[PDB]
Enzyme design. Sequence first.
Site, PDB file in Angstrom:
ATOM      1  N   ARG A   1       0.851  -1.212   0.000  1.00 43.72           N
ATOM      2  CA  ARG A   1       0.000   0.000   0.000  1.00 43.72           C
ATOM      3  C   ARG A   1       0.864   1.231   0.000  1.00 43.72           C
ATOM      4  NH1 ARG A   1      -3.058   2.696   4.768  1.00 43.72           N
ATOM      5  NH2 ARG A   1      -4.008   4.337   3.568  1.00 43.72           N
TER       6      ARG A   1
ATOM      7  N   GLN B   1      -8.101   7.148   6.574  1.00 43.68           N
ATOM      8  CA  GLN B   1      -8.648   7.334   7.925  1.00 43.68           C
ATOM      9  C   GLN B   1      -9.614   8.500   7.986  1.00 43.68           C
ATOM     10  OE1 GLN B   1      -4.897   5.359  10.379  1.00 43.68           O
ATOM     11  NE2 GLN B   1      -5.635   7.404  11.054  1.00 43.68           N
TER      12      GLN B   1
ATOM     13  N   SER C   1      -9.668  11.065  10.993  1.00 51.22           N
ATOM     14  CA  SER C   1      -8.521  11.806  11.408  1.00 51.22           C
ATOM     15  C   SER C   1      -8.466  13.265  11.027  1.00 51.22           C
ATOM     16  CB  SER C   1      -7.230  11.058  10.928  1.00 51.22           C
ATOM     17  OG  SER C   1      -7.212   9.744  11.484  1.00 51.22           O
TER      18      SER C   1
ATOM     19  N   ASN D   1      -7.733   0.212   9.125  1.00 52.64           N
ATOM     20  CA  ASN D   1      -6.502   0.362   9.941  1.00 52.64           C
ATOM     21  C   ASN D   1      -6.844   0.065  11.352  1.00 52.64           C
ATOM     22  OD1 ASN D   1      -5.520   1.387   7.508  1.00 52.64           O
ATOM     23  ND2 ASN D   1      -5.125   3.469   8.243  1.00 52.64           N
TER      24      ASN D   1
ATOM     25  N   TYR E   1      -4.891  -0.107  15.316  1.00 52.36           N
ATOM     26  CA  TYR E   1      -3.755  -0.052  16.256  1.00 52.36           C
ATOM     27  C   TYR E   1      -4.051  -0.419  17.698  1.00 52.36           C
ATOM     28  CZ  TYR E   1      -1.318   2.237  12.400  1.00 52.36           C
ATOM     29  OH  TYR E   1      -0.624   2.520  11.210  1.00 52.36           O
TER      30      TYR E   1
ATOM     31  N   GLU F   1      -3.460  -1.016   7.633  1.00 54.10           N
ATOM     32  CA  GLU F   1      -2.381  -0.620   8.479  1.00 54.10           C
ATOM     33  C   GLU F   1      -2.554  -1.373   9.792  1.00 54.10           C
ATOM     34  OE1 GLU F   1      -1.811   3.655   9.262  1.00 54.10           O
ATOM     35  OE2 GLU F   1      -2.289   4.114   7.104  1.00 54.10           O
TER      36      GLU F   1
HETATM   37  C1  LIG Z   1       1.270   5.105  12.467  1.00 53.48           C
HETATM   38  N1  LIG Z   1       0.584   6.208  11.757  1.00 53.48           N
HETATM   39  C2  LIG Z   1       0.766   5.955  10.295  1.00 53.48           C
HETATM   40  C3  LIG Z   1      -0.838   6.169  12.224  1.00 53.48           C
HETATM   41  C4  LIG Z   1      -1.881   7.146  11.694  1.00 53.48           C
HETATM   42  S1  LIG Z   1      -2.968   7.791  13.005  1.00 53.48           S
HETATM   43  C5  LIG Z   1      -3.751   6.744  14.142  1.00 53.48           C
HETATM   44  C6  LIG Z   1      -3.298   5.439  14.832  1.00 53.48           C
HETATM   45  C7  LIG Z   1      -2.292   5.678  15.905  1.00 53.48           C
HETATM   46  C8  LIG Z   1      -2.522   6.762  16.742  1.00 53.48           C
HETATM   47  C9  LIG Z   1      -1.538   7.074  17.671  1.00 53.48           C
HETATM   48  C10 LIG Z   1      -0.350   6.406  17.724  1.00 53.48           C
HETATM   49  C11 LIG Z   1      -0.097   5.378  16.820  1.00 53.48           C
HETATM   50  C12 LIG Z   1      -1.072   5.030  15.949  1.00 53.48           C
HETATM   51  N2  LIG Z   1      -4.908   7.076  14.531  1.00 53.48           N
HETATM   52  O1  LIG Z   1      -5.464   8.213  14.033  1.00 53.48           O
HETATM   53  S2  LIG Z   1      -6.599   8.926  14.950  1.00 53.48           S
HETATM   54  O2  LIG Z   1      -7.461   9.829  14.300  1.00 53.48           O
HETATM   55  O3  LIG Z   1      -7.338   7.758  15.531  1.00 53.48           O
HETATM   56  O4  LIG Z   1      -5.778   9.519  16.010  1.00 53.48           O
END
Ligand SMILES: CN(C)CCS/C(Cc1ccccc1)=N\OS(=O)(=O)O
Lengths: 499, 499
Positions: free
Chosen positions: A93, A185, A188, A326, A328, A407
């Site tokens: 990607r 996203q 975001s 995505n 995390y 992701e």
């Molecule tokens: C690694 N990077 C390419 C991630 C893009 S942002 C993310 C996920 C996240 C948020 C905070 C710390 C790490 C990852 N979340 O976006 S959010 O709107 O939920 O804050």
Amino acid sequence: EITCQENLPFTCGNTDALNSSSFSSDFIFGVASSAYQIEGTIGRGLNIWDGFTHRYPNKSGPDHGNGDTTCDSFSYWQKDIDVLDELNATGYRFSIAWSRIIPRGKRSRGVNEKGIDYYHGLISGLIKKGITPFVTLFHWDLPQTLQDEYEGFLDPQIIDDFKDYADLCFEEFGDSVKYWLTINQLYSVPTRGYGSALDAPGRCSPTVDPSCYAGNSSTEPYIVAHHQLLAHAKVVDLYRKNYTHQGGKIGPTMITRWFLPYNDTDRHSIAATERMKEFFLGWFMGPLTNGTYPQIMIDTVGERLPSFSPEESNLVKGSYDFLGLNYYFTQYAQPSPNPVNSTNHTAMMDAGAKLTYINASGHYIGPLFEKDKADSTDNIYYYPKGIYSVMDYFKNKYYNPLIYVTENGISTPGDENRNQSMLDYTRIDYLCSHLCFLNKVIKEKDVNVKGYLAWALGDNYEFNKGFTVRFGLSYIDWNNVTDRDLKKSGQWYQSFISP
Amino acid sequence: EITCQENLPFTCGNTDALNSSSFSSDFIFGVASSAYQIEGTIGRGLNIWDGFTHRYPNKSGPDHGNGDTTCDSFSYWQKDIDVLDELNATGYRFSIAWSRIIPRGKRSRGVNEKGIDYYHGLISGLIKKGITPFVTLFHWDLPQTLQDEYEGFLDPQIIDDFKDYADLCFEEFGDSVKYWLTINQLYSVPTRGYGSALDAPGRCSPTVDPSCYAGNSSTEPYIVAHHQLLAHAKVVDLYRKNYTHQGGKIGPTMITRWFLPYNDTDRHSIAATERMKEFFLGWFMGPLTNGTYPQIMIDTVGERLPSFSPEESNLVKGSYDFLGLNYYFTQYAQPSPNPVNSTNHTAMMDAGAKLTYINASGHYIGPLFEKDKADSTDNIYYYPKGIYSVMDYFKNKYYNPLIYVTENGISTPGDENRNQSMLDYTRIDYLCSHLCFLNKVIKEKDVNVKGYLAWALGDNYEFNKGFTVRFGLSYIDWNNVTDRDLKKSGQWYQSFISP
Ligand SMILES: CN(C)CCS/C(Cc1ccccc1)=N\OS(=O)(=O)O
Ligand SMILES: *[C@@H]1O[C@H](CO)[C@@H](O[C@@H]2O[C@H](CO)[C@@H](O[C@@H]3O[C@H](CO[C@H]4O[C@H](CO)[C@@H](O)[C@H](O)[C@@H]4O)[C@@H](O)[C@H](O[C@H]4O[C@H](CO)[C@@H](O)[C@H](O)[C@@H]4O)[C@@H]3O[C@@H]3OC[C@@H](O)[C@H](O)[C@H]3O)[C@H](O)[C@H]2NC(C)=O)[C@H](O[C@@H]2O[C@@H](C)[C@@H](O)[C@@H](O)[C@@H]2O)[C@H]1NC(C)=O
Ligand SMILES: *[C@@H]1O[C@H](CO)[C@@H](O[C@@H]2O[C@H](CO)[C@@H](O[C@@H]3O[C@H](CO[C@H]4O[C@H](CO)[C@@H](O)[C@H](O)[C@@H]4O)[C@@H](O)[C@H](O[C@H]4O[C@H](CO)[C@@H](O)[C@H](O)[C@@H]4O)[C@@H]3O[C@@H]3OC[C@@H](O)[C@H](O)[C@H]3O)[C@H](O)[C@H]2NC(C)=O)[C@H](O[C@@H]2O[C@@H](C)[C@@H](O)[C@@H](O)[C@@H]2O)[C@H]1NC(C)=O
Ligand SMILES: *[C@@H]1O[C@H](CO)[C@@H](O[C@@H]2O[C@H](CO)[C@@H](O[C@@H]3O[C@H](CO)[C@@H](O)[C@H](O)[C@@H]3O[C@@H]3OC[C@@H](O)[C@H](O)[C@H]3O)[C@H](O)[C@H]2NC(C)=O)[C@H](O[C@@H]2O[C@@H](C)[C@@H](O)[C@@H](O)[C@@H]2O)[C@H]1NC(C)=O
Ligand SMILES: *[C@@H]1O[C@H](CO)[C@@H](O[C@@H]2O[C@H](CO)[C@@H](O[C@@H]3O[C@H](CO)[C@@H](O)[C@H](O)[C@@H]3O[C@@H]3OC[C@@H](O)[C@H](O)[C@H]3O)[C@H](O)[C@H]2NC(C)=O)[C@H](O[C@@H]2O[C@@H](C)[C@@H](O)[C@@H](O)[C@@H]2O)[C@H]1NC(C)=O
Ligand SMILES: *[C@@H]1O[C@H](CO)[C@@H](O[C@@H]2O[C@H](CO)[C@@H](O)[C@H](O)[C@H]2NC(C)=O)[C@H](O)[C@H]1NC(C)=O
Ligand SMILES: *[C@@H]1O[C@H](CO)[C@@H](O[C@@H]2O[C@H](CO)[C@@H](O)[C@H](O)[C@H]2NC(C)=O)[C@H](O)[C@H]1NC(C)=O
Ligand SMILES: *[C@@H]1O[C@H](CO)[C@@H](O[C@@H]2O[C@H](CO)[C@@H](O)[C@H](O)[C@H]2NC(C)=O)[C@H](O)[C@H]1NC(C)=O
Ligand SMILES: *[C@@H]1O[C@H](CO)[C@@H](O[C@@H]2O[C@H](CO)[C@@H](O)[C@H](O)[C@H]2NC(C)=O)[C@H](O)[C@H]1NC(C)=O
Ligand SMILES: *[C@@H]1O[C@H](CO)[C@@H](O[C@@H]2O[C@H](CO)[C@@H](O)[C@H](O)[C@H]2NC(C)=O)[C@H](O)[C@H]1NC(C)=O
Ligand SMILES: *[C@@H]1O[C@H](CO)[C@@H](O[C@@H]2O[C@H](CO)[C@@H](O)[C@H](O)[C@H]2NC(C)=O)[C@H](O)[C@H]1NC(C)=O
Ligand SMILES: *[C@@H]1O[C@H](CO)[C@@H](O[C@@H]2O[C@H](CO)[C@@H](O)[C@H](O)[C@H]2NC(C)=O)[C@H](O)[C@H]1NC(C)=O
Ligand SMILES: *[C@@H]1O[C@H](CO)[C@@H](O[C@@H]2O[C@H](CO)[C@@H](O)[C@H](O)[C@H]2NC(C)=O)[C@H](O)[C@H]1NC(C)=O
Ligand SMILES: CN(C)CCS/C(Cc1ccccc1)=N\OS(=O)(=O)O
Ligand SMILES: *[C@@H]1O[C@H](CO)[C@@H](O)[C@H](O)[C@H]1NC(C)=O
Ligand SMILES: *[C@@H]1O[C@H](CO)[C@@H](O)[C@H](O)[C@H]1NC(C)=O
Ligand SMILES: *[C@@H]1O[C@H](CO)[C@@H](O)[C@H](O)[C@H]1NC(C)=O
Ligand SMILES: *[C@@H]1O[C@H](CO)[C@@H](O)[C@H](O)[C@H]1NC(C)=O
Ligand SMILES: *[C@@H]1O[C@H](CO)[C@@H](O)[C@H](O)[C@H]1NC(C)=O
Ligand SMILES: *[C@@H]1O[C@H](CO)[C@@H](O)[C@H](O)[C@H]1NC(C)=O
Ligand SMILES: *[C@@H]1O[C@H](CO)[C@@H](O)[C@H](O)[C@H]1NC(C)=O
Ligand SMILES: [Zn+2]
């Protein structure tokens, strides 16, 4: 029967127990990147991430780092393909930088043929090595001109400019690219870009952050979110009506989290948990599956929430062939007041929830994810079962979609030295623990997930963080960015892929 | 009777022989700077110099350096005032960054109040220390949005956007600033920005430089030059009609050179020398004094040279209260063909002249000015008598104008170490030799010159050159830009000013 671990220590790094053969044979495994984060500004116009990192250097990262040169994938794209070839990846990607193909934003002003050639070379090189490209049209890097003309996604003029850009991408690349992602996203940019001003373009209400040049954190996230949905849907309709001959698929990218109650026997915490699902996921998924915002949002946000016309609702409803998810981490939710009259009111307060990684009995949800050096009580912790919970929820609530995990990954601190950074066993643990749960949910719940793309190929500029965190499966030396050397995690993933 | 030296060694560094008392008591002495070169991008929008240095890093400088942080005069403006106070300067030329006060280019889109406050603080601090500000409205740093909307000065839309910006500057600052400069070095942007593409925005014909994104080196310099004259004149008329109550003066900045024949007994070289005066100076000075381009230009350039309407001619004619004259060096001229049909034709070829620093008998014109490491045969050499010749010419040919010397200076190599850089006796020699000639021409020819501003206050980003050359009277350490430490030249100038 499949048993996955939730807590340290993990044993899923052993490719005898978990590997690509654990999944269906057609399943795609790869890594992900984005253009601002990897390419550099050489050969392109300026975008709002250039603008924001340069106007607000303390918001670019603690190190004031930015995407000016970064890992120089403009020069070193073949080294990226070499990493993917080493991994025996079957997917990658990446994003197209609007400012690289249409530096002046609006297509009628001209195209950059050398920009177009850059992506043609990349795409051809990927396919030549058996790698399926998954191409993001918009990974936050709007041409600065459009932000300066009409404030970008704040204005409905974005829809046609985005459409004309997407049209160019499909015309030039769609004979070879069969998997397109529209906007990265959806949650975001509205929240971070127009709510907290942590991200570009950096707008917010004056008492949220007095450095912001303009904005209204209470109203603008909803405006921007609405225009993102309309812009997305217009591009999905163009794709499905005018580019059907290419035999490809298109969808949005969602950021997903799971939510659990802060106190699982407290009805108020249980309610805040369900609100969070609606406010974080349903904000976009309601429109995408029903053509309307969630009722809780209609009720709470009131006159601040834009309406869809019947025509708009029909356009947005069902505007995806698949979802790029995505994932995390997961948060606990508890109630919080929503003071709609406070001059520092933000859209994010409308959910009526306070989010934590510790529950009311003092349990941390999982292993450390990201240390917060400024306040350790705000460290982020991860939750491998969350990927299971999210996918099951999407199947059950959102009409059994086709999903690609676009992701998933974890950072290590940029303060580490090279040896420490290469010995990224924490990244093995994160990735394997989530892939174990992912396998489990596909088998147990029959969720239609067809690939997985770890974040990131290589160390890069991370939004907000500069070079203070590393997310790569391959290591980049900031004093000499040419090489991308597989870390322990990269080596592991190579063996997971080809056990 | 005044005798000035033309060749090494100079003895004018002795403030017993030459000092500020040599000049009239009201004469202004100071230094100059520009916003892109000193401020940094913190707190402003992006302009075409950000865009050009980032899109074409090898054109920014050999070191790929740019104005992102530079000497950080955004933070350290008070240190600049402290240098000027140390010098007992009575004038300072600086520029306002359009992108700092109107980041979105067009005034109706909003102003940056914090930008406005930056300049208010600077201006107040200068006046508090008895320093006369000389404020350049436009020192090349056009908002990128305007370049992306309509290609900037290529389009007549620039005139009204420039006018509205200037109007803001006069409204906010004109109660305190009494000396305004419109556009820096009228010749430069057309030729370097739209002819050779050595400068922003980087447009040219495809076989002049295949990296250029667009352009036509034969036609666009004339278009841009014409729009610069019209934009200048519209702002001078606004100033003189709507801001007369401020009791100030306004004018353009010219780059000046002198020209001598390559062979002073060859009529062809003599003719090329006079063409050069018309093509380099008269291009702008003809319009400014007569409302028409020089006849030689009308005859040679033909349909490529735009016409002024009667209304336009009247607007541009006489559009100055004074001239800001920059002066660095003088060239020998010889004939050269003008192949108007060659796909690599440039406007600069229309003068029919080839320029050198060596004459036909092998005499170099003066001391070394700038070494060219890539080709020593193209080293630049200076000519102190040239400042005398230029000023006399302006008096005689252009109606005895009021003149301020708005730039004059010399670089030392960035390869030098700090000690070497501080021991800048070459800069003393250059500055004193030119001030000796300047005194001489004021006394002998009665040229109406009323001040002198050396380039530059401090080391800064030099256009095209990055940090590879230093022009400052004060030294800046690129590893820690806070201090500005007077060099030998700064110390000398302090004593010249207060002997
Ligand atoms: C690694 N990077 C390419 C991630 C893009 S942002 C993310 C996920 C996240 C948020 C905070 C710390 C790490 C990852 N979340 O976006 S959010 O709107 O939920 O804050
Ligand atoms: C999937 O999308 C579906 C739409 O395609 C969703 O169903 C819509 O849900 C709407 C509520 O969000 C609902 O709208 C209400 O409609 C009421 C009925 O109006 C008709 O019949 C009346 C009685 O005979 C008559 O008086 C009317 O003239 C209409 O013919 C209407 O009374 C409601 O208005 C009252 O309440 C509002 C809110 O308090 C007041 O502001 C208002 O003055 C009045 O007192 C309300 O109508 C809407 O009012 C707000 C306004 O901005 C809107 O324009 C106007 O439409 C609508 O009936 C249904 N449509 C259908 C076709 O069922 C669906 O929502 C789920 O299902 C509905 C029934 C409801 O239970 C929702 O809570 C559910 O979530 C979507 N699904 C999901 C999962 O989101
Ligand atoms: C300061 O600005 C002054 C203007 O305010 C400059 O003077 C103008 O100079 C013009 C030349 O650049 C000059 O224009 C020419 O005018 C000729 C005379 O036209 C009238 O009378 C004719 C005879 O009775 C009649 O037929 C006409 O109808 C007019 O009434 C005209 O013949 C010229 O046109 C011929 O030559 C051109 C060029 O070869 C051909 O293209 C054309 O077909 C025709 O054969 C020419 O006119 C212009 O033609 C080109 C066109 O684009 C223009 O629109 C059209 O005007 C004009 O007379 C004067 N104006 C005045 C008021 O004197 C002045 O220039 C200096 O002085 C003039 C006389 C001349 O010697 C120039 O070389 C000088 O430099 C400016 N000063 C400086 C220092 O720049
Ligand atoms: C998870 O949430 C549950 C449900 O909210 C928490 O259990 C509740 O805890 C309340 C105290 O925070 C208990 O109410 C107290 O009851 C005592 C004894 O009668 C009374 O003296 C207190 O003033 C208070 O009573 C309330 O006062 C405010 C009124 O508006 C309200 O009507 C009154 O009830 C409440 O009984 C209890 N509910 C249940 C079903 O057990 C739970 O809190 C944890 O367990 C409880 C048993 C108690 O030991 C708490 O100290 C302990 O925190 C919470 N769990 C965690 C880990 O926070
Ligand atoms: C500064 O410019 C002057 C004027 O142009 C140069 O003087 C001229 O130099 C020409 C040679 O470049 C002389 O013409 C030559 O004369 C000889 C002897 O008769 C003849 O054999 C050559 O073929 C050539 O004659 C020309 O051929 C081409 C024809 O189209 C043209 O009609 C012929 O004249 C020319 O006489 C001379 N003019 C004058 C007035 O002296 C001058 O060049 C320098 O001085 C001259 C005297 C000679 O020594 C050159 O070698 C020497 O370069 C030039 N100065 C410099 C330093 O370049
Ligand atoms: C954000 O914009 C909203 C809507 O324009 C502003 O909320 C309005 O606030 C005014 C003045 O208090 C009230 O008359 C209206 O009742 C509000 N409308 C709505 C829908 O809530 C709000 O003040 C702006 N916030 C800031 C910080 O500018
Ligand atoms: C980050 O840089 C910004 C400038 O981009 C600074 O923001 C100032 O913020 C303070 C604190 O709220 C305000 O009172 C000022 O009005 C802001 N100034 C400007 C020009 O916006 C901020 O101080 C910097 N942050 C840190 C932690 O140093
Ligand atoms: C905080 O989270 C912990 C861990 O998930 C919950 O504790 C589990 O609670 C279940 C049901 O009571 C017990 O069977 C498990 O033994 C508990 N696990 C552990 C590790 O203690 C806890 O209930 C949560 N607290 C609240 C208030 O929701
Ligand atoms: C690249 O991945 C492919 C596919 O998984 C590997 O080819 C499989 O290898 C296994 C184990 O040897 C065999 O069971 C399959 O029959 C092969 N499948 C196909 C479709 O060819 C290939 O060996 C891997 N390459 C590298 C260098 O690891
Ligand atoms: C620069 O623009 C000029 C003017 O449009 C072009 O010169 C024209 O060239 C065409 C094709 O050769 C001719 O028909 C005309 O006679 C020319 N007009 C003039 C006034 O000279 C020129 O080709 C462009 N150059 C490039 C490199 O694009
Ligand atoms: C300077 O960088 C530019 C890219 O901005 C390079 O320009 C290439 O220039 C060559 C030589 O004329 C052309 O043939 C190519 O078409 C240009 N490429 C692009 C993308 O514009 C140039 O090679 C670099 N210069 C040096 C000396 O390295
Ligand atoms: C090249 O420049 C030199 C220096 O200015 C000229 O030489 C001067 O020429 C005059 C007039 O002939 C003599 O009185 C001086 O003695 C000469 N000075 C020196 C230092 O030689 C020379 O004439 C120029 N050459 C040409 C061809 O123009
Ligand atoms: C700053 O410059 C001023 C003006 O030249 C200096 O004041 C002059 O000083 C000379 C020599 O002492 C006197 O002849 C004049 O009478 C003074 N003029 C005025 C108008 O006051 C002043 O001394 C210099 N200051 C410094 C610190 O060098
Ligand atoms: C020092 N810097 C602020 C100078 C601005 S540019 C200059 C004069 C010049 C040109 C080359 C080398 C040094 C100075 N000339 O401009 S030009 O159009 O004649 O090339
Ligand atoms: C792959 O993992 C499975 C368990 O899912 C195991 O049975 C298999 O042997 C592993 N493959 C290899 C080569 O180790
Ligand atoms: C399809 O392209 C045609 C040709 O330009 C255009 O007229 C039409 O509106 C497009 N359809 C879409 C975006 O659905
Ligand atoms: C928001 O404003 C309220 C009212 O003053 C204040 O109590 C609260 O702490 C503010 N929130 C933040 C995050 O600053
Ligand atoms: C940069 O790293 C590359 C790849 O390892 C190496 O070949 C090259 O010599 C390095 N450049 C410098 C200046 O060390
Ligand atoms: C200033 O220079 C002049 C010559 O122009 C000289 O006569 C005078 O004494 C010098 N002043 C001082 C203080 O040296
Ligand atoms: C003067 O300002 C007035 C007030 O806006 C305006 O209408 C007029 O056109 C301006 N005059 C100029 C630019 O000469
Ligand atoms: C311009 O083009 C001509 C014709 O080919 C060529 O001889 C000349 O050397 C070119 N000029 C430059 C500076 O490249
Ligand atoms: Zn930069």
